[PDB]
Each structure stands twice: as C-alpha cells, then as structure tokens.
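Build the 3D complex.
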Amino acid sequence: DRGVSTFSPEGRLFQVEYSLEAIKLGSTAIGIATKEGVVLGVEKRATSPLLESDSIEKIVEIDRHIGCAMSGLTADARSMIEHARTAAVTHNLYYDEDINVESLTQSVCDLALRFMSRPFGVALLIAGHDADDGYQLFHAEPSGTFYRYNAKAIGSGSEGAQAELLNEWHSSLTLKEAELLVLKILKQVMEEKLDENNAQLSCITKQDGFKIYDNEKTAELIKELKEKEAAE
Amino acid sequence: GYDRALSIFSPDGHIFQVEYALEAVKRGTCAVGVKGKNCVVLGCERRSTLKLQDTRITPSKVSKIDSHVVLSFSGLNADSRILIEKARVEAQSHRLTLEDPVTVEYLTRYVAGVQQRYTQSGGVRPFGVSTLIAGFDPRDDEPKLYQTEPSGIYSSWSAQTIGRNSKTVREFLEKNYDRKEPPATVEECVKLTVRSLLEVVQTGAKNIEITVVKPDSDIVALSSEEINQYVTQIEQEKQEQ
Amino acid sequence: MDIILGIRVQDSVILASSKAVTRGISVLKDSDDKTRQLSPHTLMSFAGEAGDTVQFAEYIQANIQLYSIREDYELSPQAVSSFVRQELAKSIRSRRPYQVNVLIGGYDKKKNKPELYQIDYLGTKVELPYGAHGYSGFYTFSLLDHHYRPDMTTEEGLDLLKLCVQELEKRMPMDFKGVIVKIVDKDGIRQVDDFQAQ
Amino acid sequence: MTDRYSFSLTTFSPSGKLGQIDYALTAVKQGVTSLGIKATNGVVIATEKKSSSPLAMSETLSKVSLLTPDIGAVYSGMGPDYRVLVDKSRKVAHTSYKRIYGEYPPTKLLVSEVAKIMQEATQSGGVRPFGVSLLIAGHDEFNGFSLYQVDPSGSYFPWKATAIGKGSVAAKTFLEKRWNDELELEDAIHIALLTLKESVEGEFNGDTIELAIIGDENPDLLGYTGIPTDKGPRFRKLTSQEINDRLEAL
Amino acid sequence: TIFSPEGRLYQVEYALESISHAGTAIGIMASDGIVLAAERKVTSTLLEQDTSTEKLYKLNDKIAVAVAGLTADAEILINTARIHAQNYLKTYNEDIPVEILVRRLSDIKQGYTQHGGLRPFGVSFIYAGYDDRYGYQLYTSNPSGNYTGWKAISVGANTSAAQTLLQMDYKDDMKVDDAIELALKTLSKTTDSSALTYDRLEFATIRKGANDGEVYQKIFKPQEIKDILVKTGIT
Amino acid sequence: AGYDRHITIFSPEGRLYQVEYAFKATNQTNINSLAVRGKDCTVVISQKKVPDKLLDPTTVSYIFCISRTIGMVVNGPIPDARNAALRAKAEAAEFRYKYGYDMPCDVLAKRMANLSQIYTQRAYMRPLGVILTFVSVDEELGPSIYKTDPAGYYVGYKATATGPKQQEITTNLENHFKKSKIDHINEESWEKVVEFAITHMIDALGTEFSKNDLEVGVATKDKFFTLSAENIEERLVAIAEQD
Amino acid sequence: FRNNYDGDTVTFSPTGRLFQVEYALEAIKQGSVTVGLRSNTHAVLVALKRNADELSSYQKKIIKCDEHMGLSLAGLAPDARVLSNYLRQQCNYSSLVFNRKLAVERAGHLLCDKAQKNTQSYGGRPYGVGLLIIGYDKSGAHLLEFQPSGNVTELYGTAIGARSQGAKTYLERTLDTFIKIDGNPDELIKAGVEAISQSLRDESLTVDNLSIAIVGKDTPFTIYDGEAVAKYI
Amino acid sequence: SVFSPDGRNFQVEYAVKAVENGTTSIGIKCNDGVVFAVEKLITSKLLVPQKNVKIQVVDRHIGCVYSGLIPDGRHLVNRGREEAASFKKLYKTPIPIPAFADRLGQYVQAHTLYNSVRPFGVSTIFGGVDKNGAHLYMLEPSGSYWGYKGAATGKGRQSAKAELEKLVDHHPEGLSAREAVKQAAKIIYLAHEDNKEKDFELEISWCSLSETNGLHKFVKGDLLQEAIDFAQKEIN
Amino acid sequence: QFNPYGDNGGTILGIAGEDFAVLAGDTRNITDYSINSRYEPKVFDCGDNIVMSANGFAADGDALVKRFKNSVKWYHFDHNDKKLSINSAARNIQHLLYGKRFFPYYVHTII
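Done.
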C-alpha cells in the first residue's frame, strides 16, 4: 500500500496485476476466429431471476466490421466502447475507409495506459474483419497490452475454457462448428444450465458485418448441440 | 490540485471504496419498485430517530427527473441530490438537442455513467447511493424499471428493491412476482408493493410512501389514508387459519 | 422586421406574431410559430436576427423547464421576465450579443392578474398594457392608445388585435403573411388557430 | 517545485478535536502575556517587550501595531506569524473596504477579516494554523470603542477586558476584580500597568513595556491642516517617557 | 472524505462528534411564527454581551440561522449564503424561497464530503424563515450535507435530553408566545450552568408583525431576554 | 516517526521541529561572525576556514554584497546561504525599481524574515538552515544591523554575534557596552572599528588570527565593501602594537 | 534498510540506491530475449517473440522509427510504444526542420533524457523496458542499448531479456568474426540467429517464433516475420 | 524537504553515497586553463572504443564531467546549457565561470527544498576560461560548490586527491596545460587502483588560453597517446 | 500592412487514363514580372504511388505537400504499413486544407 504506478520487486505493476484479478471474477467470454467469420459468446449471469436478461449488454457493436465482448467490471468498459466507436468513425471521416482491427485495438490500449486514477477492471475481446488481414480476434488487457488469438476465453471459467479451446480449435473450423463450440464450452464452465436467456451469441462476417443473434436463433443451436452430443 | 487516487484495487481485485459505498446503501432506508402491465410503482420507507418532523417540507424519496421519469434511492441522501441535479440538467439538455424527452434507458445510462466516473477519478469518493429509475418512454406504453449502483453497473428489473433489509423483500418478490402474469391493475400492483414493504417497516403508518407512474407523464403520489386502505385489506384477510 | 404584438386585457394576455420567414428575395415559410411556451402559464414571443432568435428562445425554455422540474413549482411571469432580462443584459456586453427582442405574456396565478412584459435585445424591460417590437409598433401604439380599455374581455381584445393586423396590412411595406394568435389566461395557453380567413 | 500537499493538515480526531488548532492554542499559552482594557473614552492594549540579550534593540520590534488610524493590534504566541497577519490585515482593510467605501473599516469588520484569514489556514491544503491570538482594539463612528480577541481557529469575541498568553489566568482574575463600566482612560492605563506587573520577571520600565491607546483624535499626528472634517488618528503608541511617568505614581 | 468498512464518512462522523460539545440551539415553529433560542458556551463577566453575536445570524430579511459548531467555519458559510440570497433576488426580483437557500448551503457541505481532500465544516444550522409558498419553515443542516424539516428541533449539546422534552410539550396549534416559553423551559433543564441567566442566551423571533401582513425579524437585545425570562418564571 | 517531525505542522507542545532542526543547521560550518557599529560605519567579521588544500581560498566566503549599500553575512551551509543571497539581491533591485530609492537594511531584513516565515507555515517548503545578518549605514537610521533566523524572526541590534561560540562573544560585547555606557564604538575611522571587532573576537574565542583566518565586511555611507587579505593583515599589525 | 525506501522514485535508500528504478530494471530480466549486432555496412536485430498460448500470437517486438533507424524491446510493451513514438517524432522533427536524418547517438541521448525525468518526478514511474537501437547514419552503422535507468551505451553487439547472458557471452567471443561481415547481409543475420540460440533451454526457434530487422548502406530499415525468415532456421 | 535532528538533510546524504559509488573523475587547474579527465569502465569487450563520451561541453568554453548517476549528470548539463544560452541572449558576452557555477548551484540546491523532488546523484567537476582567467569548480548534490586548484570525485577520490595535493605543494609556480594533461592521465591511472575489477578507457579534455584559444576541446590522437604512455611509465 | 500571401504562377494539369494517370506542371517560378527560377519542380512523388501538386502561393504549396508526405509516413506507422489508397489520400487532403479554413493555403491542389 504505497502508490498506483508503483513497481513490485518482481518488476510488475501492482495495480495492473490486481486489475487482472478483478477480471478473473468476471462473467465468462469466449471468442473463436475462423476463415468464415469470428464468433463471440458470453455468459449473462443474472444475479437474480427478476433481472430482465436481454438488458445485459456484454457484447457491443463498435463499427459494422468490429464487435467486442467484455468481462470484469463491465461499467469501466463504457468509456472504452465510446472511445472505440469515436476512433472508428473518426478514422472513416479522415480516410474514407474502414479502420483496421489492429489499429482500433491499439487505440483502445492507448486509452488503457492513461492512468484517470486506476486501471480498468475489464478486459475485452475485439473481433472483426478488414481487407488486409481478414478475420481477427484480439484480447485487450488494462495493462495496454493486446494479443491476437485464434481462440480465447476470459473470465472466471477461462482456465478450463482455454484448455478446451486448445483441443477443439483447428485452422478449418466452419462458422457453424465454431458457434457450436462456443456454446458447448460455455455450457461446461457456466455455474448454471445454458439456455437462450443466460447466454448470448454473436459473430462478424465480411458480408453481413457484426450481428448479435437474437434469443430465437440461439435456442435453436442449443437444441442442435444437445442432439449433436446425444448421438455421440 | 488534489488528485490523490482513492478508488484503487486491492490484491484480490476489489475496489474497497466502491465496496464500502454499497455498505452505505444497505444502511439506507429501504426502497422498492415493481412494474405492472400498464404501470410501474415505487415504494419507500421512513426511519424513526425522531418524529417531531414536518412532512410538508422534508425532501420526499421519489424525485421527478422529467415529467415522465422518476428516481428513488437508497443510501446517502446528500449524495443523491447531486445525482438528481445532473439527471435533471441532462433531461433538459436531451430535449434541447434531440427534440424528444429521454428514454428511461438513456437517463439510466447517463446516471450510471456519472457513478462510474466517480469510481475512477483522483480525489473523489464513489456515490454512497444506489438508485431505482422508473417511467415510460415518450409515446410508448411498455413500462420501464432500472437499477444503478455505486459501481456504475445498471440493469432492468421486473421488480427490484434496495437498501436495508432488501435481502428479505427480494425474497418476497421472487416467490410472488409472476413473469407470466404482471399485476394487470394499477390497484393490485400497489398491492404487491405494500405487502413487500410490510415485512420490514412495521405499521404502514407515517413510514410507507407510494408513487404511481402511468404512460404520458401521469404520475400521482399517495396520501396517508389511501395507503391505510391497503394496510388494512391484507392484514385482516391474509390472517386466515 | 417581423411582427410581434402583445395586448393585456382584463383576464388574459394575447400575443400575435407574424408567420413569414424571409431570407433575401424569398419568403421561405408562411406558417412560422415565433413563440415558445416557457411554462403552462407563461409564453414568450421573439423577433430579430436569423439564428439567434430560436437558439435564445429554446435556451430560455430549457432553463425555465429545469427550474419547474427542480422545484415542482411554476415561476411567476415577473420572475421569468427578470431571468430573461438579466440574460439579455449579460449578452449585450459579451463577444457576440444575442440580437433578439421579446414579449413575455403570462398569467400570474398567485395574483390572478395577467401580465405583459416587453424586453429588447439590450435588456430593457418594461410592463405594459400593450406592446410591440420593430416597425409595427410605429402603427399599433397610437391605434391602441385610442381603442384600448383596461377592462376589456378576451373576445374584445381579439377585436382590438384584428384592427392592429388590418392596419399593418394596409400600411406596412412587406407581406408578413398574417399572424398566429395565442391566449394566456387562468386555464393556460391556447391558440386561436383560425385568424387569417375569419 | 509545485505545491504537492493539497489536503488539510488540520483534520478531526475521533473525539471531535481539531489537533492543530489545539496545538496552536498551546503555542499561544507559551507566549508572553498581553492584555486589553475597554474604558468609556478609550481602549488600552499592552504587552511585555521580552528582549533576547540587551544587545537587541527593543524599539525596533513592533509588538503593538497600527492597523488603521483608529485600530490597533497586539498578540501572544509566534511573533513571525503576527507580523505577516498585520501586513495582510492592513492590506485587506484597503482592498476590501477603503478602496470600495472611501472610509476605513469599522473594528468588528476588520476583525471579521483577520478571522477569515486565520480560518483559511485552518482548512486550506498544505498549511498549519497561525500560532497566535490577537487582541484588536478600535473605534468607529457607529459602534464607538470596542475590543476583540481572535484565536487560531478564527473565532473572535468581544471583551470589556482580557489577557492572553503565559499569565492569562492570573490576569483575567485581576481585571475582573478591577473593571467597572465607568472607567476613564487614565484609569484603564493604570489598571493595565498593574495587571502587567504580575506577568513579568525582570526589569519593569518603559523600555520593556509596549503600550498603546485608542483615544481622542490627535490633530498634531495628522501631518496636515486645512480639512477641519478630520482631526486624525485615535490610535496612539505611548512613548517610553510616558510609561515611566505613570510608573512613578504607581 | 473516505469511506469506512462500515459505509460511514470518518471526517463527517468526527465533525458531528465535534458539534455535540457546542452550546445548544433550539428552533420551534408556531402557527404564526418561529422561535430561535441558543445557549452560549461557558462564558465570563468580562465578555461583552451588548455588541456580541456568535450563535444567531440574519441571512436576509426573511431568514435567520442558529449556529452550533465552529464559529469561524460558520462565518464562511453565512457569508456565501447571504451572497446566494442576493444573487437570487437580483436574478428573479423575488426573495429566495427558504428551501432553495437551505439546499444550496447543504450542497456546499456535501462537496467537502465527496471531493477536494479538504476537511468538512464543523457546523450545524437551524434555519428559521418565511416565504409565500410554504409559510414558516424550520430546517436543519449538518456537515454531511443533509437537510430535513422540523416542527421543533435542537442541535449541539444535549440533543437527546432536549428532543424528549419538545415532543412532550409541543402541539401543532401552538402560538409564538408559548413557543418562546417552551424554548426557554427546554434550555433550563438541559443547561450545564447552575441556572439560565440573560447573559448566556441569544434569542430571535420571526413573527407576522402585529397588524400589517408583512414579515418581521427580531433579534432580542440583552435587556429583552432578561425581561422575557421574568414573565415565564425563571427570573 | 510522526509527521510533526518531517513537515512544519505543530507538535502537541506547540512546536515546530523542522524549524528547530534548521537552527541546528546554522552551526554546521563551525564559524563565528560578529557585527558592530561605529560612529558612521558598520563592521562585520567572520572566521574563515579553508580545511582542504585543494580549494581556491579566494572563492570561500560567507559574506555577500547585496546592493551598493547593504552587506550580508550568513551562518549556515553555503547552498542555503547562496539561495538567500540571490533572493535578497533580486528583492533589493526590485525595490529600487518599483519605489525609486535604495532598499533600507531593516526593510530587506523584514522581507527576508517574511519569506522564511512562509516556510515555517507551508508544508512543501523546508526552512533554510541559515541566519542572515544585514548591515549598512542607512540614509535615515545610520549604522544598522538586522538579523533574521529560520523561524521568521528579525530584530535590530546594537551589536551581535552568531555561530557555535555565539554566547561567549555576545557577553564579551555586552560587557564592553556596560562599561562604555554607549551603544556604538566611538571611533571616527572604520579601520579602528575593524580593529576593535577583531580584538574582541580574539579575546572571546581564545585564538590568534593570521590574515587568512578572517573575513571582513565594512559598510559606509553609500558603500559596502569587503577587505582583502592584505588590508586585514595591516589591521592585524596595528592590534599587535597595542594588545 | 529496504523498508520505507521503495515507496516512490523520488526517494534514495541509505545505500544510495533507487529501488523503484532497480525494480523497473527487473521487468527486463523477465522479458523475452532479443539480440543486436552490427558490422561496418549493416546492423541487425533478432528478437525471439513470446506467445501467451499455443493459440496466441507471438507479440511483435521490433518497431520501425525512421527509414534509417529502429528498435527491439524487452519488458513492458506499452512502454516501448511510448518511447519509440517519441523517437518517431524526434526523427521526424529532425527531417522537417533541418532536412537532416537524426543521428543514432542523438536518439540515444534523447531517450536517456526522457527516461531520466521519470526517475526524478513524483507520481511518475520509470520506464519498464529495455531497448536495442540499430541505425545507419552519416557515420555508419550503429547499435545502442537502452536501460530504463536512463543509461545508454554504444556497442558492436549485445542482448537483453531472459537468459541474455548466453548470447552476450557468444557475441563477446564471435566479435572479430561478425564485425568483418561487410556487404554481406545474410551472414550477419545468420550470426545473429546463432547468437540468439545460446539463450534457449526453451526450444528450436520456429517460423512464427523469429523476428529479424535490418538496416544498412543501401538497405532501409525492414522487419521480416514468418515466410521471409524461414531461410534462417 | 526534511532536516534530520542534527541539521543535515538525510536525502542529500544518501545522494552522496550514490556519488561515492561512481566512476572516478577529476579536474586540474593550470596557469592558463583547466584539464578534465574521467575513468570509463569497460563493462564488456563489446563497448565501442572512444564512443561513449562522458565529458560534455557547455556553450563553447565550459567543460563538464561528473561521477554518480550518469542520467542525473546529463540533466544538469542540459539545464546548464539553457542557462548559458539565456545569459548570452540577454548580455551578449559568454557566461563567466563563477556565474555559470551559481546557475548550477541554485538549480541543484532547489532540488533539496521540496518533498516531491529528489536531489541529484552526481558531483560535477566543471570549468573553463573566461575574460579574467581559468576557473575550476566542483558541485556536490547539496548545491555546495567552491573553486579548486584540483578536484576529484568518485570511488577513487581519496587516492586522486592525495596526488593532486602533492602537485599543488610541488608546483607553487603553476603547472602547464600540456603537463596537466599528462598528470591527469597519471592520476586516473593511480585512481583506478580502487576500482580494478574492470578494465577502463581514459578520456581527457581541456580548455587552455594558448593551447585552444580558450575553447573546450577533447584530447585525441597523438596527445592522448603521449598521456597514456606517460601514465603507463610511472606504474611499471 | 503585411500581406501574408503571394502568387508564384505556374500551371498544373492532370489527366487519367484507363490504367494510368499523368500529373504535369511547368517548372517556372515567378514573382510579379520577375523570374525566380526556370527549374523549380512542383509535382512530387509522395510514396504509395501518389503524385501531388499544390499550385498558387508556393510557400503554402510547399507546406501542404510537406504535410501530406508526413501524413503518409504516419499512416504507415499507425496502420501496419497499409497502402494509402487514392480516395483515402484525397479525403485526408480535404482535412489538411479545411484545418486552415480561416487562414487558407492559397493553392489549387491536384493529385
């Protein structure tokens, strides 16, 4: 207990390390990056059955080609989203084109550095498409570091989720396979039974952009998963 | 230039100032809100340190933000005046620039936003306040109820309660409130509200206060007597062996 | 010059405002409302420089509505008109003054009197039985000096305005495209939405 | 460089004390005793000129200071704190009052202003309270003669007579015994000299005593004639010679 | 200005603790006026009582306050409240409604509670005033920035004792002269002095001014308190 | 350790430890100075110690020419001494520009005293570990000595001394003025006043001085100057053929 | 003795040490390994990137600064961004105002001065990254080592990060060989690849594992990753 | 901004330790100039010889060398340079050495006044030729400085100081610039005795009225070898 | 009074083909009736296969081209060496010019 930007004897930033702890307590978020698209799924985790589930916005659009899932202290994510949107629209204003997914992420991570009194208590999975590098997935920590992943999971269930993502991911996953896998791996790590109300799916395709799946299209895949896993 | 960081992380990943802000909320008098088919009802309680109070002039717990939205709070009363002022200023500012009154969701997002900012700025403490915000969007009939807390998280609720002994009343509401059937009458929606408050308050005398919001800026407070008509109907009739 | 008239009768206040909006060599609109409701019993009419006119009215409106919602109470016409005056008197010495003249017509419920306040862009306030801004005043003040009585009914006040408008149609150089008329009494604010061909 | 202590150094303790103000009062207690007595046609303020070695020139140190032509001040506690307060008080008598109304402030209001400056050091960031208590004596056309005490907290109160510092308890008692609401000025000077004989250890003469009155207008202390509508300053430092003459018949 | 694990504000709680040692002030509200009574802290014979003011301050012509706490801290707050009232009058050509002025002072207090790392003011106020919306009003504010409205209330020393007595003897249809009596009687039983005398009291009334229809502020002089002490049977 | 030991807040006894520690710092250089007044001059003397042989002895000084008319001697470490020197120089030039006459000795003392007083009160500034003795022949007051310390204190002196053996020198002077019955040295030439000053310095320190163990500043009507080694040597010769 | 003396950067220990700065220095030892070496015609960076998972990227560790200059990082990556950005500006300012390519030596002095301020201002923190700076200017090829303490040194070769001592040892002995690899880029790169190897208990350096950057006499600064580096494994 | 109970400033005191811990460096005054010299520890064979210049010029006529934290030294010189520029701009003439000394003095001293700044961890030896002679100065972390005939700071300061003391005593007539350069090479070699776990490079600079026209210049090539040789001679 | 503007003459021409473009200019630079230079180029390669001329007041023209070249350099830095498309360059040049709406670059610019 001495300062905010203080170094530990092991050369880590105290507050940055403790923010990482907050993220571990967050609802689970999973992302899978394929050649047909990128999928983002989350665990709603209502703290009570009276909470209206569809008012839980843990997947948010940034630009038509860029979406993002969060985990941790989700309130801290507000000004990152806002800043992300401004960066993407501003880029289109100055350059008459879509911002690169890596540039958008780098910008959010720039914001992350500006500690503002404390680091953010939230990590973000940023997914989208651009002409140059195709379908991409990014993990953005409140350290200002970001990482590209073929697949990634963040939140309380992430240790087991990552392990499962390690077995199941290969460079030829179809989008529909990838959707099923996100749903499956969420079902395993969620402290509740996965249905269309406590889990949300979304993806970005080159052609259709970023779409949040409504509860009806999700429920179908849940039903399709229960069956794909009955026969086997 | 005082910017000494007060809201910081602890080794287990908790922001203790935000946490103790929640403690101040749970210390505050209870507030509840429940939404009907064509309405939303907000209910509060009063304390008993002294009862030589003048009730005409003492700040009521339900505040009008615009003519179609209201805010009630649990926690530090002084803190809530500040959140209400800003919400009032924003409501006028949204009308001025967008030529429409706020949606309940938008006003909620704004207030939650202000709370959040206070969790990460130097030399400020979080708000010792959690809020229930209720009303109807302009030209819309579907009722709206939202809750914010000192962290800046916000969400919508079929029904919700906050403050001292809210654990108890959330218990009651969870068994009684049917997702299938919301209290279709204004009347029976005020019923579920007074019942839920009776567990905590004692006699629903000079302590329980109620406010009803209908669409198109229709907002009526109740009187002691019209409350007493609900206190009476449940005690005697739901006393049956 | 746009036409902004106000007449205070015994039980109400009536405001008549020209419907034309002219930029250059074109009448762009013949149905403009040069009025903002400030509260249920207070109405402001405005004329002057193009953009300043609405920006000011709507800023005054925002402030009064805010006050109402904060106090669950309506400010008196005397109070609102003092707010507006001070706002203009501030503006006159700033980097770019608001070039707007106003009439404030309200019904004070505490007093049960109707009230008419005339305020120009400099922040000059006065209470009058009848008022006007711009050139139109050069015709109406004398006309009303003759025909006005302090104890007229609202129906009588509307006949007094009819004279005023007809006079302005005979003698004013520009086609102001008729007037919108509004009444502020004990029951609030209403529009006589049928003044033109009547 | 830059002020990096932006918070209050005087805070509340769990018992409701404000530590630094208490400790400042403790500092005042160590201070050399000083007193003021309000008569019917004047006010007197007095203190001891505690010399440090006889090589120091006692006259060159101001313990009693003119604030306005009608107002004086004396203190107990930390001299350097008094000296800067006298400067800021003189200046504020001008900026806040004479430059606005064209006349010097009434005593209660100048006192109000010193009180403000001292309160501020009780609450501002990175500062400690002043370690002094002041005694301010003055006259104005509408309130007549007055006497006030200002403390480290910025509290002030009016007194008919009082003392502060080392031997304050002993002297307050002595004055209570001797004060009546019909005293002439020369009577109050005499009582002041008696009360001050207790405090003091060593020599007791006009060169170890600083004493000033607020009395009648002194036309010969104006510096000019011709505007008959002021007769001049009511404040008047007594000379070493004047103190001794009253000490012989003491 | 930080939170305890319990959810209370250290410096505030300690400030209220500070106030509990201050001379008691009472406000009582009648049907036709408000009484302000306050007790001076362990005083002296030599203390000037004539030109003395320390507990009762006029805010404008329609509103007075009684102070319990740090006298100097209250001087700051009184001055900026006086200014706010004049700002309101200048802006609107109407005297400030009591509630509004009370809210503003409380909001100032609340600030020190939440930001800046300065200490709160060690002050509580009883506000007595009149406006044409709500008539006579009695309010209270403390260093937390909290304000509430009262039929009768006390602040400073011995509020528990004093509060019990006011509830026992107050009844809605009171007249001002009975409220004066009640104020003095309550202070008689909660004092720490042998008995209550004139040089230890500050007294003020906000009446309807005999025959006029206009509001009057009276701050009782020494000799006037001495007299009103005789009539009630305390001599 | 309590904060009342590190910053200038009060201690329960009503004390300021940082100020007290700053007084201690004044003796760190282990040098004594004294100042006396003539009929129409003012003289300051200070021991001069050059331990290290590698030092250039002409640059080792604790006397400062503040203005044409005002000299200052410091008792304390040099960095702090030079800080106060530069500030006083700046203040004395500013005064003349703003007010059209030379800053008097006591007024500059007061101004420096006030500057020190601030450090006494504000937490982010440490006091300066110095005592400053200001001297001049003032146009209104004649020979003048005014001395300020880290507390914000200042006063005028008939004569004075500062340093480790302060009290010894003080009483030595006190004793002279008790017997002489006047408040100055009754000599016309400044050379005899310097001679007096060195002599009483010798008799209270129990030490003999060569020309390099001293430092002399003299203030006359409209000039303050320091003496060279050789002028001091010639002064030491005249005291030899007498005392 | 180690107690209240590591609170901030604005505090000396009784030994005369600045612990916060020492701790920031420690973030480098924990960082992934990178190597730098030069002859008289070219300068080379070789950076072994680190991954988080088998599914993650090998975070890029080489940043271009101008056409004639660039750097490799080991430590806090965000801090490499702050400083290299500042270097991009100083290079840019040199080009615009003076039509002058900025001297590597001046770049070193500038980085030193920027890091220094953070070892002395309250409420700030030292930079938590070490940097290897290569460049080609009017005096030839150059390599510099940046330490977050503000210490910069010009060298023929060096290495920083995890187990850097291995590569630094190899380089101390291969000195007279590589310094003479003039007008032959590929051999100098190879000598860099073989230098980085003496610092791997880890494993075989692979296709996505390796990063190479080069600048030289008629070669502007260019980073090679993946396909282009395959011929060096 | 903290006095310890003995009147010293404990943060300055710890700064001194950091200096004592540094490479040894010296300055020698001669009869028409000043010479400067420093010990450059050869951390590794990989250091480029002659290429990690420690000595720095200020304006055109002032030399600066230091021991301690090298970044702290560079910060000081940067400031010295602005203080030189600012002086020349206003007064035309280049800054006299005593004047330049007080400029660094006050600045270094300022960093001992406030609790939010730490003092400098260097002692700096600097000087040059101005309108009336050569001047040598050394400035300690407290801001204390004086003029010197000879000066040394760093790990081998004591052995170096003893050598300097010998020269002063055995050359009351004054030393020559040419000579002081050789002598400085000797002294750094002698001083390396108290730091010999590493190999070292010698660096020398000078500012002489007749040998450089009163401008600061580095000692390179022929003259640098003659100095190394002379120093190698009186160690075998 | 100081006039911040001048006019250095010259003339630029751009033609686009099916799979090429040309941008041409004369090399003459003038002031009033004097010739400053017979060969001062004002058409520049800006990298990323874009040529640019900013004709009119040559001081303003040079500042603009300088700024666009720099804009290209930073585009490469900030956006992973992406090629700047001609439409993107154009839009960027709009912003450069409009930043000086109230103290304009007196140039007709063609890319």
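Chain F has one domain: 1-243.
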